[PDB]
Amino acid sequence: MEGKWITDQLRWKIMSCKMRIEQLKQTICKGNEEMEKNSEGLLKTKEKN
Amino acid sequence: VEKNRKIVAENLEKVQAEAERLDQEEAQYQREYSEFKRQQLELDDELKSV
Predict the structure, then answer these.
(1) Can you say how many angstroms the Cα of residue B50 is from the centroid of all Cα atoms in its chain?
(2) Does B19 touch chain A (CB under 8 A)?
(3) Residue A2: strand, helix, or coil
(4) What is the 8-class DSSP label of residue A49?
(5) Looking at the record's lineage, which domain of life comes first (chain A)?
(6) What is the DSSP string of B3-45?
């Protein structure tokens, strides 16, 4: 049981590192999409202006 | 990415504001053009009446 707890700690650490990388990537993707939409709207408005 | 996104949102708001300010400046300039053209038309009409 003790070894199981230690291994759970370490393996959950590695997995949490991966999961954090993943969530950061998802947020970056959402931000990039928002930026692209804003850039498109800005370009259209700039042409009209 | 977040720095770029924040800069982008700020610049989009700034661009909308710049467009609005240009619109206001253009409205003021059209008002001034209205005054000047009205002056020209009144002066020509007065020269003709004279």
Answers:
(1) 36
(2) yes
(3) helix
(4) -
(5) Eukaryota
(6) HHHHHHHHHHHHHHHHHHHHHHHHHHHHHHHHHHHHHHHHHHH
Instruction: Spell out which residues of chain B touch residue A49, defining contact as CB-CB under 8 Å.
Output: 19, 22
Residues of B in contact with A41 (CB under 8 A): 12
CB atoms within 10 A of CB B12: 17
Nearest to B5 among A35, A42, A49 (CB): A35
- In angstroms, the CA A28 to CA B39 distance is 59
Instruction: Report d(CA B37, CA B31) in Å as an integer.
Output: 10
Q: Please give the structure tokens belonging to residue B3.
A: 């720095």
Resolution in Å, one decimal, please: 6.8
Burial A39-49 (b: 16+ CB within 10 A, else e): eeebeeeeeee
For this PDB entry, the determination method is cryo-EM
